[PDB]
Design a protein around this nucleic acid. Structure first.
Ligand SMILES: [Zn+2]
Lengths: 191, 94, 52, 189
RNA sequence: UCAUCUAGACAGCCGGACGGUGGCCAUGGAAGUCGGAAUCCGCUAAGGAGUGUGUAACAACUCACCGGCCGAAUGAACUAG
């Protein structure tokens, strides 16, 4: 009880780098930059020698030490994203009523429209946020792919879409027409 | 062939419908032994024997419900022939 | 043509969870103890292919 | 060392002279379909998609079990199984003939084509088939001459199966979906 | 309180169907209990008459000490603030 001093190692490659203010963190790499605010728990960071950043905390309960590995996961995942890119492949499925999806720009907004979903006839709209793009997958039927640097934005967008394509007042296990993720990987491979 | 049957699962085609054996797991014994087998197999089933037919049993010794494994003359006399269904020439012990 | 003013409030609530196949019984995510009334709700949980 | 000999110092030591290779992976198929056809010549087949006891193997290092296993040497993560079979593949097309009464598959999986087979009268009573309100089967009878009013397609490939839709529909004794090739390698040294 | 660990196990995937499973009801048909008794053996890393089980069984599938790198505490049942 009361782990007086507990830490965790985090690596960083040579191409990228990071700069930590008092509480803000800012990563920069070849693919781009990224920033994040850590005004949540206030744990210490200690450089060793250009490759090894140790996250550390002193005196706390299990609730207080869990946040340590949580922020380790956050930082190493986001630097992995900015040094390697993330992508999410989702699929469409339809029983009898085929879907009609489209991308539409207006006023520098860039929304996405969905139509013919179980016979609806007025627009099912959904927006998109920055730092992420989409292309309809060629040479393959009924898929879409998100691709970006961060993870929180793109995962939230995919979840928003796959939650918006929901239906009620019908049979609860016969109708399984919608959109859902399928693959979660990187824009590159083995790097 | 044989009225006996063990579990199976294979392919199908040609809109089939017959009352024959569905190719169980122990038909190689029927293939290597004599052809006749559907007859004299109503109720009489022998749980006895001591016969050695084909001398390629070293492979069946492994995991074909291995009879003896180590002791060449402890349980072979009890399992081999007893597990066989070749002939019913005499009925004197189950 | 239908309007979202009707479609949304017709399909707004919470029809979405896993699905069962065997004995006509799926169980929810949360876990306190065994399935019976004194206990209730086991600790089974898994993703679904498509939201129903 | 009491029980380990029956697997290592017994079976492998008595059959350390095999050079066949049948690498298969059960990704998602009816297990007995591949299992019975690996068997049938039963007693020479057993799946052994193994575990990590190679620290102990190196501690007791003097195996030389399969020198032909040097191909996926950087695949120490859910490796294939050390299974021993030396069967022939020119047996099913000549030795066994006219089976035609094997068991159907799971009965429920997806079919490749949209087919409606014509039903012949048998002279039985209707059973427990009063569950079709969702999509259904609009049909009409007139003394054998059946007439379908509208057609329905239920599902495509890449989706799981329902729960209570495999009772008294496929009554032709046909395996709905086996018809496939699933094997990683089939070599001999 | 009870069992395993530097003689190094957990969380990163598998399956186990030899004889009985073709076990009984006024001698043209009943293949693992619709109307009633019973769950062991030789086998001894695989190697079951089964919680559920398609015409009112003849054509029945899923699962059980075993097995591929790294490297250290984990697992189970109770007690009261
Ligand atoms: Zn309960």
């Amino acid at each position: 009880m009361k782990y007086i001093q507990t830490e965790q190692q985090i690596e960083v490659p040579e191409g990228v780098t990071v700069s930590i203010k008092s509480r803000i963190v800012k990563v920069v790499g070849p693919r781009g930059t990224l920033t994040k605010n850590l005004k949540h728990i206030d744990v210490t960071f200690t450089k060793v020698n250009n490759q090894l950043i140790k996250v550390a905390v002193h005196n706390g309960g299990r609730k207080h030490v869990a946040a340590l590995r949580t922020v380790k996961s956050l930082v190493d995942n986001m630097i992995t994203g900015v040094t390697k890119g993330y992508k999410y492949k989702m699929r469409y499925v339809y029983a009898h009523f085929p879907i009609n999806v489209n991308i539409v720009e207006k006023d520098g907004a860039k929304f996405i429209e969905v139509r013919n979903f179980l016979g609806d006839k007025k627009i099912r709209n959904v927006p998109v946020r920055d730092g992420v793009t989409i292309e309809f997958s060629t040479n393959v039927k009924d898929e879409i792919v998100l691709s970006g640097n961060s993870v929180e934005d793109v995962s939230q967008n995919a979840a928003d879409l796959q939650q918006i394509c929901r239906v009620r007042n019908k049979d609860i296990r016969k109708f399984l027409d919608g959109i859902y993720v399928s693959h979660k990987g990187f824009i590159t491979e083995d790097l | 062939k044989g009225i006996k049957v063990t579990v199976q699962l294979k392919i199908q085609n040609r809109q089939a419908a017959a009352s024959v054996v569905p190719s169980a797991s122990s038909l190689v014994i029927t293939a290597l032994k004599e052809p006749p087998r559907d007859r004299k197999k109503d109720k009489n089933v022998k749980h006895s024997g001591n016969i050695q037919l084909d001398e390629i049993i070293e492979i069946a010794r492994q995991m074909r419900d291995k009879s003896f494994g180590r002791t060449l003359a402890s349980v072979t006399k009890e399992i081999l022939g007893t597990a066989q269904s070749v002939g019913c020439r005499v009925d004197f012990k189950n | 043509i239908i309007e979202p003013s009707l479609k949304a409030l017709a399909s707004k609530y919470n029809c979405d969870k896993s699905v069962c196949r065997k004995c006509y019984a799926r169980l929810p995510p949360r876990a306190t103890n065994c399935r019976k009334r004194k206990c209730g709700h086991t600790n089974q949980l898994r993703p679904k292919k498509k939201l129903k | 060392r009491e029980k380990k000999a029956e697997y290592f110092a017994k079976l492998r030591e008595y059959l350390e002279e095999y050079k066949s290779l049948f690498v298969v992976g059960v990704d998602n198929v009816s297990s007995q379909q591949m299992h019975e056809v690996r068997k049938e010549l039963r007693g020479r087949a057993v799946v052994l998609m193994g575990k990590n006891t190679m620290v102990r193997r190196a501690i007791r290092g003097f195996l030389s079990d399969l020198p032909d296993f040097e191909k996926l040497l950087p695949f120490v993560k859910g490796n294939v199984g050390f299974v021993f079979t030396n069967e022939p593949l020119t047996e099913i097309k000549n030795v066994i003939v006219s089976n035609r009464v094997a068991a159907p598959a799971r009965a429920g999986a997806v079919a490749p084509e949209d087919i409606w087979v014509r039903a012949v009268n048998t002279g039985m009573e209707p059973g427990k088939t009063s569950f079709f309100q969702a999509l259904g089967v609009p049909t009409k009878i007139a003394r054998g001459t059946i007439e379908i009013v509208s057609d329905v397609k239920v599902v495509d490939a890449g989706n799981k199966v329902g729960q209570s839709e495999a009772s008294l529909l496929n009554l032709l004794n046909i395996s709905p979906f086996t018809f496939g090739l699933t094997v990683v390698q089939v070599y001999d040294n």
